[PDB]
Structures are given as C-alpha cells and as structure tokens.
Symmetry: C5
Amino acid sequence: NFEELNSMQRYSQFAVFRAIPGALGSDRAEIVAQAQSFFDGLETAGKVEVRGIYDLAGCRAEADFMIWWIAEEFEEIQAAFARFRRETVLGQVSEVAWLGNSLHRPAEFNRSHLPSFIMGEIPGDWITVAPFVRSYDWYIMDPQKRRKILAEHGQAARDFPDVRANTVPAFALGDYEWMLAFEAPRLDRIVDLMHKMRYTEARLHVREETPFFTGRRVSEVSELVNVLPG
Amino acid sequence: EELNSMQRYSQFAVFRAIPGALGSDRAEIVAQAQSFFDGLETAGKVEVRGIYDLAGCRAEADFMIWWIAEEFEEIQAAFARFRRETVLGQVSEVAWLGNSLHRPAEFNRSHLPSFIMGEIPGDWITVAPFVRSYDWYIMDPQKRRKILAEHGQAARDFPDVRANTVPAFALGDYEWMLAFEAPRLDRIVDLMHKMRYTEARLHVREETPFFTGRRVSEVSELVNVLPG
Amino acid sequence: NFEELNSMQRYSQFAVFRAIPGALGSDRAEIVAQAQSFFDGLETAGKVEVRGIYDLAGCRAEADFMIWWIAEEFEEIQAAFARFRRETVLGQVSEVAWLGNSLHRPAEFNRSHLPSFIMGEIPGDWITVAPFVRSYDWYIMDPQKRRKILAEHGQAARDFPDVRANTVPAFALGDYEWMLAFEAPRLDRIVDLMHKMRYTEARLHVREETPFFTGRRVSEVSELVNVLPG
Amino acid sequence: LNFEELNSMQRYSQFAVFRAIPGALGSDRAEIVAQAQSFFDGLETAGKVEVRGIYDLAGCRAEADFMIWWIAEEFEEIQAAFARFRRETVLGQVSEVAWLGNSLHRPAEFNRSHLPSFIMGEIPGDWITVAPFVRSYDWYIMDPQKRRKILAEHGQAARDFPDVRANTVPAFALGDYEWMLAFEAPRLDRIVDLMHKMRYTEARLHVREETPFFTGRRVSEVSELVNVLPG
Amino acid sequence: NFEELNSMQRYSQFAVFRAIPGALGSDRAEIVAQAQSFFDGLETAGKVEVRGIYDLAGCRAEADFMIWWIAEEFEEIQAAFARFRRETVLGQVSEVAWLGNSLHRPAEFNRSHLPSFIMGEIPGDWITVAPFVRSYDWYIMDPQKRRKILAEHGQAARDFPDVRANTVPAFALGDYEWMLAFEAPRLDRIVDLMHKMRYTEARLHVREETPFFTGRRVSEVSELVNVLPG
Ligand code: FEC
Ligand code: FEC
Ligand code: FEC
Ligand code: FEC
Ligand code: FEC
C-alpha cells in the first residue's frame, strides 16, 4: 500500500548550470576545495540531500553540469541554490541554464508507482532528466480510459527493470506538469527504453517533453570541475 | 458590487539579477531600496502587495514586485522610478511584466480577486498569464457558464488558496493575469493538479511563464539572497 | 473626400525602442533640448509626420518607448529613423526593439473604414499597437462569408466610438499581414474593447497578434527622456 | 530565350543578411568604404561570384541592417567569398550575421517558362523583398493535376504585377527551408500590393512558414550603404 | 541480415561550433598545429573516430564548423569533446552551437538498411546533418502500414545511390528522435534528394526536422582554421 511513502513531502530540483568560458581558469584547486566544503555542509545540516552531481559534457549546447538535490521544504532548496550561486566561486563562474522543480505525490491509479529517490534506491550511474506536459484532454478523459493507457505504458517498460523511473508533479513549480528522471547503469538502456515507449497509446496525449539533460554521475565535485572549460 | 466596479491596475514586475553587478557590499543598496518603498507607501498611490524571492523557480528570474494602483500611469511612474533612482533597479534586469485591470466576472459577480477583497497576502505565490482558445468567448454563454462553474467546483478542497484572475487584454501579450496565494507551496501545486480535471482545460492556448516564490517581510531579506 | 482618402499613399511605422542602462546618465537637459529640436525640425521639413511619442514604461520587458511617424514615401521614414538613431543622443543610447511597418490601402468591403490617422483625427492620449496575421483560409474564403464576419466584427465595437481604430496592410514590410493601432482617452477603454471583440466569429480566423505595445502619448519629449533609466 | 539552357544551368544563390554592431563603425569610415569596395571589385574581377545587389534594409526590422545577394556556379565559391568578407574586411569584422538564405536554381515542376529573374539575366529591381518558404506537409504528395491547377491560379493572381519580378528557388538542405523567394520591383508599394493580392489563392491553404522577411533598397555602391549604417 | 553490423554499439556526435569574433586573430599556424596534434592524439588512442571536420561557412547564422566523431562509449565522446574545449586554443575560441547525438540501432523492418559509417563507407565530400522527430502517431500505426510507408520512402531515393544515408536513433540524447546525415560527392545531389523525398506518404508523419547543417569536408584542419573569422 506504500501509504507512508505515498504521503511524505519531498521537493526535488534538477539545477542545470552552464560553464562560462574563461571564468574558471586552470588553477582549480581552491575552487574544488570550496565547492566540496559547500556540499559537505549541506550533508551535515541534514535538510538538503544531494542525490547526484552530473557531468553533462556533450549532451547539448548551453549546459555543462547538473545538481539533483531533494528536501522536505522548498525554501531549503531555495537557500542552498542561492547559496551555491552567491558564496562559491563555482557558482559565481557558472550560469543557470534550466531548473526542473517537482513535488512528490501518489500516482492516480497505481499506488506502487513511486519515484526511485522516494524508494531510497541507489542512484544510477547514468541519468536523463526532462520535463513533461500532457495533452489538454489527458486529465478530463474518462478515468478508466486513462487507467488503461497508463497500464499499457507501464507494460511497455517490462524489459527494462534496470532503468529506474522518477515521475513527479511539477505543476506551478515552473512551466511544466511533470519532472522526469530515468536512472540506469548504462546510457544505452535509457535510449532503448525511450525508443520502445514510443509504441504506446499514451504518445497520443503529449504536448511537450524538452529539454532533455543527459549525463554521467560523478563521485565527487573534483571530477566534474576538472572537466569544465577554463 | 462597488467592488465589481472598482478600478485597480495590477502589475507583477519580475526582475533578474545581473551576475557580478550587486557585489558583496549591499548595506547602502538595501537602505536606499527600503527608502524607495517607504516613499511609495506614504505617497499613497501605489500599494505593494508583496515582494517575492523567486530563487530556484526558473532560470532568468530572481525576484518579483506585486504592486497595485488606481491608474496605470501611477504604476508606470513607480516602475520607472525604481529602475531609474535605486541602485537595486539599476543593477537588475526586467525579465517579464504581468499587467492586468480588475473587471467583474462574466457570470459570477461574487468572484472577486483576493487583492480587491483586501485579504492578507499569502506566504507563497504563483503568478502566470493565461490565453483561452480562440473559440472560448464565442461559445454558447451558458455552456461557458457551466464549464466555469465546474472549474470552480473542482477547487472546493482548496479554500486556503486565494485566487486572483484579472483581465489583461492589451496590457501585454495575454488575456488574463492569474495569481494564487497560499500559506504553503504544496497547496498551490495540488490545486493546479486537481484543476486539470476540468472541461475548461479543452479551451486553453497559453499559460506560461510561471513565477513562483516566497513573500519576504522587507527588502533586506531579498537583497541579501541575490547572487551578487 | 472619401475617394481621396482611400487612394492616398501613406506609410506608417511604429518604431519601438529599448533603453540601454548606463548610457543616458543623469544630466539630460541638453539631451532633451537636442531631441526636441530634431522633432521640431522634422515637423517643419514637412515630409515625416510624428503622430506621437509614447511612454511604454511598464508595458513589457525589453521596450521603453515608441515613435509613431507617417510619410508619403517609405524612404522618408528610413531617413528619419536613420537620422534619429545616428544624430540624436536619445537615438544613440537606445536599441531598436521592434518595427511595425504598414501601408495604407482601401478596405475590402467598407471603404468608409479608414485609419484614424488618415482621417486626420487628433491622436489619442493612450495607445495599443500590435501586428496581426489572419488564418490561412481567411482571404480565399467565400467573399460573402468574410464580409458578414467583418460586418459583425465591426458591430461588436459599436459601444466604443471613443476608441479610434487604425487597421493597415503590412504585407512584405516585416513578418505580418496588418498593423493595428487603437487610440483612446483612457486605457481601460482599450482593454474593454479587446475583451468585447473576443465575442466575434472573426476570432476563429486568427494566427498571430503579438507583441502588443501599450502606453501614454507624451506632450513633449522631456516627459519621456526624464523617465528613462540612466 | 533558350529555356533549356536556362533551366539546366547550375547556380547557387545566397541572401546574406547582416546587422551593424552598435558603436563599432565609428565616425571615420572612409578606410572601411575603400577596403570594402576593393573587396567587391576583386570578386567581380575573379569572375566566380556575381553580386546582384547590396541592399539597405533600414527600417524593415530590428536586428537587420543590410543584405548581400550574390550568385555562383559552385556553393563553395559563395562559402569562400562569404568567409573572406567576414574575415578580411573591417565591414565584415564589425557586422554580425543575422540570417542566410541559400538556394539552388532548378526547373519548375510544371511551367518550365517560369524562371528566376536572376537566371533570365534581368536588371535587378530597385526594391527587394526576400523571405524563405515552407509548404504544408501534404503539398508534394498531392495529386499532381491538383497541384498544377493551384499553381496556375497562383500565377494568374499575379497578372497585374508584371513589373514585380519573381525568383522562386529550391532551398532544401541549404538551411531550414524549402524555397528561397525574392521579389524585385521599381517601387515598394508594388511588392506590398502583390503580396496582399496573392493571399486570395488556394495555394494559401498549403503553407507552413514564410518568415522572416527582409525588405530594402538596392544601393549603387558600397559607400551609399556604409555611410547610412548606425554608428 | 548483417548480424554483427546491426548489433554493434556506436555513439555518434555532430558537434557544431561557432566562431567568436575577435578571438582567433590573424596568428593561426600554431593553433592549427596544436589542433592537428589533438586529432592525431585521438587517432592514436583509437577510441574516438573522427569521420570528418566540416566547413559550414555560409550555411546559417551562428554556426561555422562541425566535427563528426564516433566512439563505442558515449563517455569517450564526452571526454574528447570536453578535452577539445578545454585544452586546444581552437576549442577555447569557439562556442558550442548545437550537438547532435545518436546511438546506432537496427532498423525496425529492413535490417539491410545501415548507416554509411557503420558500413565502413568512405565519408562524403559534402554533408547535410539534421535531427528528426516523427508525428505522435507514427510508432503506434499498424506495423505493416508503417513498413509499407518506409519501403515507399526508400523507393523514392532509388535514383540517388550516390547520396549515402545515416539514420540513427537519438532518443534521450538531446531533444530529438533521430539523427540524420546525408553524404555525397556533390551538394546539388543532396538538395535534389531532399526535394524528391518530399513526394512520399511519410511526409504526413513529421513534426520536426531542423536545424540543418550543411558544408564541405576538409582534408586537414588548416583548411578550416584559415577560413574562420578572426
Ligand atoms: C521513459 C518514460 C516516460 C517518458 C516517455 C514517454 O512518456 O513515452 C514516461 C512518461 C510518464 C509521465 C509523463 C508520467 C506521469 C503521469 C501522467 O499522467 O502522465 C508517467 C507516470 C507513470 N509511468 Fe511512465 N510516465 N513509466 C516508465 C518510464 C517512462 N514514463 C517506466 C519504465 C514505467 C514502468 C516502471 C515503473 O512503474 O517504475 C512507467 C510507468 C508509469 C506509471 C505506472 C504505470 C503502471 O504500471 O500502472 C505511471 C503512474
Ligand atoms: C489555478 C486556476 C486557474 C489556472 C489553471 C487552469 O486553467 O486550470 C484558473 C483559470 C482561470 C481563468 C483563465 C479564468 C478567467 C475567466 C475565463 O474566461 O478564462 C478564471 C476565472 C474564474 N475562475 Fe479560475 N479562472 N478558479 C480557481 C483557480 C484557477 N482558475 C479557483 C480555486 C476557483 C474556485 C472559486 C474561487 O476561489 O474563486 C476558480 C473559479 C473561477 C471563477 C468563478 C467560477 C464560479 O465559481 O462560478 C472565475 C470567473
Ligand atoms: C481591437 C480590434 C482588432 C484586433 C482584435 C481582434 O481582431 O479581435 C481588429 C482586428 C482587425 C483586423 C486584423 C483587420 C484587418 C482586416 C482583415 O482582413 O483582417 C480589421 C479591419 C477592420 N476592422 Fe477591426 N480589424 N475594428 C475595430 C477594432 C479592432 N479590429 C473596431 C473598433 C471597429 C469598428 C469601428 C471602425 O470601423 O473603425 C472595426 C471594424 C473593422 C473594419 C470595418 C468593419 C465594417 O464593415 O463595419 C475593418 C475593414
Ligand atoms: C509573392 C509570391 C509568393 C509568396 C507568397 C505566396 O505564396 O502567396 C510565391 C510563392 C511561391 C512558392 C513557395 C513557389 C515554389 C513552388 C512550390 O511548389 O511552392 C512559387 C513558384 C511559382 N510561382 Fe509564385 N511561388 N509566383 C509569383 C509570386 C509569388 N509566388 C508571381 C508574381 C508569379 C507569376 C509570374 C512568374 O511566374 O514569375 C508566380 C508564379 C509562380 C510559378 C509559375 C506558375 C505558372 O504556371 O503560371 C511557380 C512555379
Ligand atoms: C533524405 C532522407 C530523410 C529526411 C527527409 C524526409 O524524411 O523526407 C530520411 C528520413 C528518415 C527517418 C527520420 C528515418 C528513421 C526511421 C523512422 O521511423 O523515421 C529513416 C529511416 C529509413 N530511411 Fe530514410 N529515414 N532513406 C533515405 C534518405 C532519407 N531518409 C534514403 C536515400 C533511403 C534509401 C537508401 C538507404 O536505405 O539507405 C532511405 C531509406 C530508409 C530506410 C530503409 C527503408 C527500406 O528500404 O525499407 C529506413 C529504415
């Protein structure tokens, strides 16, 4: 029944940043120590949980890295986000590219469908994040019809148990209806999942699903900072 | 009634912080900004419903001023004065302006904006424009009336979310300005989710950008969070 | 007479400008005097008619003011636009934001429908200008159905005789089919006109109608120059 | 004319639209004019790239100030002249690329006497409007007899505008569009009126995109343009 | 059949860059030599295969050149992409304009249809690259209908065996569904192929297909660097 897990309050934010060429320089040791200190402090304060930091190099123009963090209260994410930008050189030398905000809620029909991060699953080595906006008719549609469509949609993913879904309401937290995050040990599994999921009636009820942000989880800030353009 | 006939223009003036412009020495900037707002209050022409920290809501937006006046020129003067004579306005950029003009509802004359009713502003706010489908206003009137009544019924479980829907024709690119004010952000999220389950959603063309943020108590609160 | 007004050749341009923070400064008396002389000169030269200069402060991001000028030859506007930008402090410190160009022509079915500025009517204290693009099927539609639609469109505006219309062809003069300008003594009259005109069948034949620019006609240049950001 | 030779010849066409960088030109422009004029002299001398005209787009739209229309047998020759203009002239160094409209002349599908004014070797018009074009998805798979009829009525709608010379040119894979369009006339109002009239055609039911438009006046020499540009 | 060529794992990236005016200057010989040694190094490491470097001069605003490279693992592309931007002057004076990422997979119906780069075919002297997004209904269409539509699509290109196609899944690797590249000895044949391919029923099942990037494969880096704006 997952009643407790369906009832908890957790805001989730994908903070996507772009490197400013020429800003970081080549002596990045102090910049890495400071950034690491900032994340250390977040962990100990216990309010904002960093699920991952991601190297988005080569995914798209105008984005380079992403922080996925989660908190019981959105003002806690606000504070940390603002703190990153204001009180760390890394945040001072990066530009905000895109923010994907969401608030976990129970599914309408399948109460066993819960985000990977809510289930406490270890995060995947590879991720793709994107927003979603359903067709205008999607929610006023007869409920048994929508139920059947979502049942097919889930069935279409049967061969990809290794790809972990995170489908989270984003209404009023930006321009979208949902935040999506797919975690997997291998990028090719996410590509193949997305390709297979095109073969679903649910595709007839879609309005927007970009931008996509795809990248590799790093073990520590030093691994990301060293990759960035100077 | 007298409220349905009241004249108030309302403006959501959304601003973006220019990285590197504010610096780390903001004491004088705060005091000057507070004097601007204090001066507005005692002149008594423009009412500031709230100033809002939008940090983390979206790229390219950082804070919002919601102010109201009887005449649009009064808002024009305050907006220009803020950009012209306060450092905070000089080192900020205008991201988006949401303008509206209070008018009665086409059917429900009791439906009145929270700011017209003088209600205390909410800790959390979501602001956005709205554009109906092309066919919406030439629809049969009782059909539209019924659709809007069911729309409102779907919000019954959210009496703590206060709504403001105000005409915005010719005051920019939109038909309506919306503001929802609540004591907790999650109430606003859940209201929008629930309100998707309505026939009115078959008659929508545009509803973005959204701006969501926390009301602050004084300008110092906001200035001290900005990126700098 | 009416034939003379329908056959007149008049180009019209809405030149919308954006202030550049930091360029104008705080000592503006000479800036004002110089701009007043430029427009005074325009008046006396007798080629370009300045119908108004409008404070757009607060209408939209990225615009601050607008010049509405008219001439028999588009080259006369090009010269006045180029001379404004090149030879006045005000034009040097402004960016061009949008240009709305149009060429007066007779209406298709009602040759008594003429732009306010062609009638020679005094300009209104408040204005809204915007482009317009009709649906693809509008002009090839049965002429009698389009005629009836426009007749009803006109009737829906009956309650707003104090709001003066200007509807002018804009084909090939930018990205639009028509330029619109609505002039009124109070802004609320324009807002309520636009709202009422939604209740017309012509709304089913629209493709584009943004950006809108709305503001206050100044009595002299000083009113505008003194409000702009420094 | 030799319609067969005109239809089979290979010519690429590029509308290169530029915007002046504010504050970049300055008030001392003679050296820039002499250098730019020397550049166009060189192109004419080499005989590869043909400049049909340089156009002053003042007052047409924000973010565009002038346009070069040049034509060559080989696209690489346009690439070379375009790059050399930007790289080796101050004019090109202090301007920004706003928009590029590339095309390759081909015979028309039904009326092989319909040829671009530039292929016919006609004097270029004093006024020009250029724009891309993208047809509806269904346009090409349509019954050919139906498409033919629609295009015949389209051409008929322009019967009163023989002074406006058309250039309709394929643009597939040379940018984001299906056609490049250029209409050349002795006065601007003729183009405005032609476009208005052409809305009254069935072809309008098979359109997807037709912007941005770039409209302006042909200059006689580089000096006339450089001296109008915003400082 | 082509079992091995169809099961092969290859990521492909089109990395489109734009020149930063004023950055390169007129001193370029050492920049060329450093870039050449960067690509020589990639070759010797044997992980990332550069299929071509392309001069896009004159194709479109805000793009100037493209790298087409291929690797078994996407992280190897990320590393080369990041190393190009970080450790070569050429990378540092260029801006990322657009990235076009794809992952080779077997065709749905015709497993003899394989990308030209997967077939080991020599790259073409001229290229056009673009993304693709099909209509929402494409993949749920009856399979035999879609098969028929694609067979007629392939038939329409029968006169163009000289233009070699690369159609590659792009799901989750950006905002698109497919990456397309068409390589030929002559540019005019690519234009003619695209024209002809409009005459197919598949065209009724299309949503997005831009931006296009078209240009000439260079024989060496110096041919590219010396044409770029200074
Ligand atoms: C990938 C992907 C997308 C984006 C691409 C597209 O939609 O085709 C995608 C799109 C969405 C979107 C919006 C929603 C939000 C609900 C809606 O009203 O749209 C959304 C929500 C749900 N998804 Fe979804 N998805 N999805 C999976 C992956 C993808 N999903 C995988 C895998 C599974 C299967 C495993 C799982 O349950 O964890 C799965 C199942 C569900 C269920 C549970 C249905 C059930 O089985 O009854 C719900 C609820
Ligand atoms: C949230 C939200 C939106 C945007 C999302 C959506 O469109 O689904 C939203 C959309 C709009 C838009 C445009 C209009 C403007 C009128 C029109 O023609 O569009 C608009 C206008 C009205 N709303 Fe609306 N809304 N709305 C609420 C919240 C939201 N509303 C809540 C709560 C209530 C419940 C009542 C109350 O609190 O006043 C409510 C009811 C009304 C009534 C009164 C109907 C009645 O009860 O008979 C009018 C008139
Ligand atoms: C406001 C407004 C818009 C934009 C909003 C919308 O389209 O709903 C608006 C849209 C357009 C557009 C395009 C055109 C161009 C013609 C076409 O083919 O679209 C356009 C053209 C016409 N309008 Fe229009 N309008 N419009 C008024 C206000 C607005 N109008 C008012 C007031 C009156 C009434 C007073 C007058 O004649 O001056 C009025 C009447 C006309 C007539 C004359 C009709 C007649 O036979 O009675 C013509 C022709
Ligand atoms: C202006 C204008 C446009 C853009 C606006 C619009 O689409 O309404 C415009 C749009 C297009 C477009 C795409 C094409 C490309 C073919 C396609 O399949 O769409 C395109 C192609 C053709 N046009 Fe077209 N036009 N067009 C003229 C002006 C405009 N035209 C004038 C003038 C004439 C008449 C004189 C001339 O032939 O030179 C004329 C006729 C033709 C013929 C020859 C028809 C014949 O059989 O009679 C062909 C082929
Ligand atoms: C050009 C061009 C486009 C983009 C323009 C437009 O779509 O009209 C174009 C679009 C696409 C797109 C997406 C796909 C991806 C699959 C899908 O579901 O969309 C896509 C996929 C395929 N194409 Fe395609 N194309 N295409 C060729 C050229 C173009 N193609 C040429 C040449 C040949 C023929 C030679 C070859 O097999 O390599 C050819 C054939 C195929 C086959 C094999 C069909 C078969 O014969 O049964 C498949 C699979």
